[PDB]
Amino acid sequence: EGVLASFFNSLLSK
Amino acid sequence: RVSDEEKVRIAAKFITHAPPGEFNEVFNDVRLLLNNDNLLREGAAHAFAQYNMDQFTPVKIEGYEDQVLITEHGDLGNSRFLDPRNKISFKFDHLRKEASDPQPEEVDGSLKSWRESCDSALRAYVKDHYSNGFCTVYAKNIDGQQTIIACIESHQFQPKNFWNGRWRSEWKFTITPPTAQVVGVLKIQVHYYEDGNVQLVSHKDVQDSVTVSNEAQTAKEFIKIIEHAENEYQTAISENYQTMSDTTFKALRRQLPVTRTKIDWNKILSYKIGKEMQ
Amino acid sequence: IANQPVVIDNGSGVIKAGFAGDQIPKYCFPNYVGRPKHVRVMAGALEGDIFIGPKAEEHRGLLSIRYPMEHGIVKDWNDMERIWQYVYSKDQLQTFSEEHPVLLTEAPLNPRKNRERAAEVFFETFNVPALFISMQAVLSLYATGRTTGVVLDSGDGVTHAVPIYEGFAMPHSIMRIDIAGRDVSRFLRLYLRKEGYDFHSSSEFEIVKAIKERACYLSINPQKDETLETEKAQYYLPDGSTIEIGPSRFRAPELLFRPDLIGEESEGIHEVLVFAIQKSDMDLRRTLFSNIVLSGGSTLFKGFGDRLLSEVKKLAPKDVKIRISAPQERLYSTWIGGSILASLDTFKKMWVSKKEYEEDGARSIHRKTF
Amino acid sequence: DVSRFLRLYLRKEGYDFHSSSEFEIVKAIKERACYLSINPQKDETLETEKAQYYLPDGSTIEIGPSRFRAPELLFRPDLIGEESEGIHEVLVFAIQKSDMDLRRTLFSNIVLSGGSTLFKGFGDRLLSEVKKLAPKDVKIRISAPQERLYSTWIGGSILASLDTFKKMWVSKKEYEEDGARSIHRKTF
Amino acid sequence: SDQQLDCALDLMRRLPPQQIEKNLSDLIDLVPSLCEDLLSSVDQPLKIARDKVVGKDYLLCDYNRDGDSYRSPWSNKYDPPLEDGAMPSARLRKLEVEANNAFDQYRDLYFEGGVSSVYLWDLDHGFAGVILIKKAGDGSKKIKGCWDSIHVVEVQEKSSGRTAHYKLTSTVMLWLQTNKSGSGTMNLGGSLTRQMEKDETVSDCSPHIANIGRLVEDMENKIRSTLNEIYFGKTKDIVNGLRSVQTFADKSKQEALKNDLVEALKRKQ
Numbered sequence A: 001e002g003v004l005a006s007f008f009n010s011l012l013s014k
Numbered sequence B: 001r002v003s004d005e006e007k008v009r010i011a012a013k014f015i016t017h018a019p020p021g022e023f024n025e026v027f028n029d030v031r032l033l034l035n036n037d038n039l040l041r042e043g044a045a046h047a048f049a050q051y052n053m054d055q056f057t058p059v060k061i062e063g064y065e066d067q068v069l070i071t072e073h074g075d076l077g078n079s080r081f082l083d084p085r086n087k088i089s090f091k092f093d094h095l096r097k098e099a100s101d102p103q104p105e106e107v108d109g110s111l112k113s114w115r116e117s118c119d120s121a122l123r124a125y126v127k128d129h130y131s132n133g134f135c136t137v138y139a140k141n142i143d144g145q146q147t148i149i150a151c152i153e154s155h156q157f158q159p160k161n162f163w164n165g166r167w168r169s170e171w172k173f174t175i176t177p178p179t180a181q182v183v184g185v186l187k188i189q190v191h192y193y194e195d196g197n198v199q200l201v202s203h204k205d206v207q208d209s210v211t212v213s214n215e216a217q218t219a220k221e222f223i224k225i226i227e228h229a230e231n232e233y234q235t236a237i238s239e240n241y242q243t244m245s246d247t248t249f250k251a252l253r254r255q256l257p258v259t260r261t262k263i264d265w266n267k268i269l270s271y272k273i274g275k276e277m278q
Numbered sequence C: 001i002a003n004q005p006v007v008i009d010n011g012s013g014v015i016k017a018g019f020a021g022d023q024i025p026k027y028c029f030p031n032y033v034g035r036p037k038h039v040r041v042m043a044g045a046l047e048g049d050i051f052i053g054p055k056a057e058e059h060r061g062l063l064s065i066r067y068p069m070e071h072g073i074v075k076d077w078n079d080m081e082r083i084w085q086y087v088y089s090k091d092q093l094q095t096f097s098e099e100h101p102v103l104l105t106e107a108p109l110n111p112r113k114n115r116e117r118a119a120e121v122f123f124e125t126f127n128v129p130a131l132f133i134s135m136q137a138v139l140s141l142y143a144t145g146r147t148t149g150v151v152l153d154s155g156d157g158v159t160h161a162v163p164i165y166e167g168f169a170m171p172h173s174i175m176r177i178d179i180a181g182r183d184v185s186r187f188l189r190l191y192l193r194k195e196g197y198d199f200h201s202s203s204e205f206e207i208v209k210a211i212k213e214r215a216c217y218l219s220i221n222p223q224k225d226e227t228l229e230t231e232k233a234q235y236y237l238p239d240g241s242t243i244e245i246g247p248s249r250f251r252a253p254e255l256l257f258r259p260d261l262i263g264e265e266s267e268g269i270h271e272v273l274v275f276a277i278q279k280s281d282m283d284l285r286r287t288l289f290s291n292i293v294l295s296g297g298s299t300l301f302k303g304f305g306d307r308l309l310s311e312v313k314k315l316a317p318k319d320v321k322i323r324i325s326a327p328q329e330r331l332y333s334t335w336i337g338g339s340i341l342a343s344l345d346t347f348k349k350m351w352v353s354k355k356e357y358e359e360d361g362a363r364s365i366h367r368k369t370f
Numbered sequence D: 001d002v003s004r005f006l007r008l009y010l011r012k013e014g015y016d017f018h019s020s021s022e023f024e025i026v027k028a029i030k031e032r033a034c035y036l037s038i039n040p041q042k043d044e045t046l047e048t049e050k051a052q053y054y055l056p057d058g059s060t061i062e063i064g065p066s067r068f069r070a071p072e073l074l075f076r077p078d079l080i081g082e083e084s085e086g087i088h089e090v091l092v093f094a095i096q097k098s099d100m101d102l103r104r105t106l107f108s109n110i111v112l113s114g115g116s117t118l119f120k121g122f123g124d125r126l127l128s129e130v131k132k133l134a135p136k137d138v139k140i141r142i143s144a145p146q147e148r149l150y151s152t153w154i155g156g157s158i159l160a161s162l163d164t165f166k167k168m169w170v171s172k173k174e175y176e177e178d179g180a181r182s183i184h185r186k187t188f
Numbered sequence E: 001s002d003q004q005l006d007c008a009l010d011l012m013r014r015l016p017p018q019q020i021e022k023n024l025s026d027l028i029d030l031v032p033s034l035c036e037d038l039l040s041s042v043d044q045p046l047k048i049a050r051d052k053v054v055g056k057d058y059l060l061c062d063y064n065r066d067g068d069s070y071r072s073p074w075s076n077k078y079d080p081p082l083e084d085g086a087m088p089s090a091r092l093r094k095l096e097v098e099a100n101n102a103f104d105q106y107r108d109l110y111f112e113g114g115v116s117s118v119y120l121w122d123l124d125h126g127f128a129g130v131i132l133i134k135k136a137g138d139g140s141k142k143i144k145g146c147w148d149s150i151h152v153v154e155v156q157e158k159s160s161g162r163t164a165h166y167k168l169t170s171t172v173m174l175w176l177q178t179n180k181s182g183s184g185t186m187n188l189g190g191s192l193t194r195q196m197e198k199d200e201t202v203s204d205c206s207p208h209i210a211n212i213g214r215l216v217e218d219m220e221n222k223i224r225s226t227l228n229e230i231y232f233g234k235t236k237d238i239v240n241g242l243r244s245v246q247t248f249a250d251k252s253k254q255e256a257l258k259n260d261l262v263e264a265l266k267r268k269q
């Protein structure tokens, strides 16, 4: 789920 | 961007190649993509004309029940077609595939004896052999030479069963006292799409010769040639299907390897090919 | 003719014969010709050099066996003629070929020349009054009191799935494969060789066939029993010695569901059945899946029904009812159907006259058949 | 089996051997004076030559018809009542049981091996039998290398020299943990 | 425009399969808004490319593509040199080359020629891959055709490391053409898609690639059998229904006899 986590990580930071 | 002329050209390209018994939803799809009926219709008239021309579609005449075939040979040009059974000129709406205004048209009738004898014998034959078997016979003067054209067509559509099929056999036959020539083209188009897709397109060309002594005798000989040609063609198709898995299909993928045993994947992975020595 | 007709089901392995209207064939014997291979030295040895029927079984070790039919196709026609005259011999069905019409049963999708030569033999060498050739599966469905359903007839030479709807077998939906009980017996012979038991003799092939019949089964899961070490079950040979069979008990019949275990480019029996069902229009498919009738000897394997059910369920569409019917009279079901068909007075209109055969020939017998 | 048949025929010629040590003398007689006739029926009807063989003790024996009928057992097992295929039938049935595509190249590539293929005239006789059984317009090439006795050992040596052989053997630990299954998967 | 997407998909499924590429390109010019989406759904015959470093034929797909470049499976380099690219991994690259060798052997055994290409990529607690096979019919014999097969496999590795779950989806595009004396010309196109799931014990004796290859060959054999038997015998049946070799008078007589037989059977039950 690393690709999924990174997309969420961009959203969480912004 | 795309020019509208190119748009309707692609629309005609898709329309003319539609499989038999599915032109209506192909048309529905092409308008739904274009979203322009008025823009489409001018070239769509030519596209539908050609599709219904080369496909030999049968259209019923309500007042006659002749059920004549639409063919390039029996075309007049006022969006009208001449049924040689009873000599009836009728307008044909390609959009609805409907016959209107049955109008007698005066032909000289020089070839009517040959045309009618061939039509009678050919109807007897088509009813004997085909399932539905809609047929017509025309007379023409090609390059000044008198010719009789037999057209046979048999269609079976079951979109409920996910399959359509069409047989169409055209046979030109020139009149010549010493020896006459017969030239035939047979086309079969079958589509079947239940949880998959398969499209058979078969074509055959035949050439033979006959002798012209009596019109009834010549017509009987012609129908015997039709019998022999179509019987041998259909039996050849059946045999070709029988030898599909053995030889024809084997050129692409074999049912089993040449070793006649399933691949031992552990063997090939762990050990090399084993052809290091030579 | 007002005399009683005789039904003959000439299978590859066993040939059933009997007067029509009987509930059972009383004259079934193996379909091979035995010839003595040892040299006769005394005055008073067994007379004759051809041994067919129970005599061939009594003196089995004395004879070399030859099978005239292979995969439902008559390879040796002289031996077939000898067997068909033995059917009329005084040992079994003491009668004359001239007195009784014959209902011959034949495998489906056979070559044209086979039917032609069978008709020629029955009309010329035998002066038979009336012959009718039929199929093996449609009769097997007639036996079980049905007219719609799919028959999976698995005999000794050939196994075929035939869907019949309202009596008339669909000629286009017939499925046939040549791996059958004989191939399973050969595979069992090879595996027994791999246990340290050689049965290369022709008479020992019948002992291998008996071992197949009496001690074999089909495992529910192939790999599960393949990996598990099976208990060694001991079988008693005719001489009195014993052999430990072991894994060859279940590896042998697995040929039926995996033809690639002997390098045959063909489909399995479950695939054959499911393809026969799916080759028909869908409205009848749901009825065909319910009405599945097993037939032939090879369907009698211990656990055949369960494995076939599992495989057909694995292949068939989900949410479709599947029911396998296994009649107790599976061996004689085809003959029972032949007897039922011959009992009908309409059979009087279904046979071919000697005058009709002389006039037309194979055209008459092939237009009379389906 | 050929040497046992030769012992039986020598018994039928008056020269009788019983002892297990004298079976080795029979084996030596087979290896020394025995050949395969190209035409068995032609040589059968003709008068024999009766070549003489010197036994280890110094006595002599006249062989005659047993010289060529003994290796005949390879091509005709029915001479000892076995209803099994002959050696030529073994080869041809192995070829014809294979794929139809491979039959031509299998017929064009036949390799003899083992000690029993060293009979005088073995190659010509087998070629004649295979041609009798094989289809026409198919080239047949039976290869008879000089190292027939040690061909299989030389093959084992070639295989064991490769580094891939490390990936082929059943290790000791694999047998210790699995047992017969390790050899069963690794061999096939 | 989901309705127009379904329209385009149905139309493309309806058109002949040999002209799939040209007609798809033409249709892209009509409604370009869904074009890439269409290219994600519509299945197309594969393209061959020359890996010059090793000198091999490799198949171009959408999974190895990165922008306007295609990654070779042998060289592991894009045919257009990309300064930045997505290599699969270190371990998955060895899995990829092992799969490439294994499927080269499988292709040679089953097809005797053609081209093959296995491309792997990682996945959520697992890895996915695509196995592409192409095989154009040789011109030596009158039979001329093409076989394309795309098998996308998803491997979910269980936490224990011994068990795994495989989900295989296979699409086969077949085309055959024969020009014989009797049949004159026959042209059998077709396409067929199937799917199946399984779970297998990963081990040294039975690694991942062995399981994927076993599933792929089983699916290929099943698809070949179905195409040869059901989807071609149905066309045979249709051609036999369009015209009858036997006359209809004889058929009517046989059917009357059959009606007599079935009524007689129905009476005796």
Ligand SMILES: Nc1ncnc2c1ncn2[C@@H]1O[C@H](COP(=O)(O)OP(=O)(O)O)[C@@H](O)[C@H]1O
Pocket (backbone or CB within 6 Å): C010, C011, C012, C013, C014, C015, C154, C155, C156, C157, C158, C181, C182, C209, C212, C213, C214, C295, C296, C297, C298, C300, C301, C302, C330, C331
């Ligand atoms: N209980 C059984 N288990 C397994 N096989 C059997 C059994 N009984 C009979 N057979 C096999 O079935 C075959 C006979 O089946 P049958 O229906 O008579 O075939 P055919 O129709 O060709 O005569 C024999 O070869 C025999 O080996």
Ligand SMILES: Nc1ncnc2c1ncn2[C@@H]1O[C@H](COP(=O)(O)OP(=O)(O)O)[C@@H](O)[C@H]1O
Pocket (backbone or CB within 6 Å): D003, D027, D030, D031, D032, D113, D114, D115, D116, D117, D118, D119, D120, D148, D149
């Ligand atoms: N020159 C020869 N002529 C005939 N037979 C021979 C000859 N040399 C060896 N043999 C036979 O070949 C056998 C040995 O063959 P070999 O290849 O060693 O068998 P194996 O494969 O069991 O080792 C012996 O039994 C011997 O009788």
Ligand SMILES: [Mg+2]
Pocket (backbone or CB within 6 Å): C011, C136, C153, C155, C296, C334
């Ligand atoms: Mg039977």
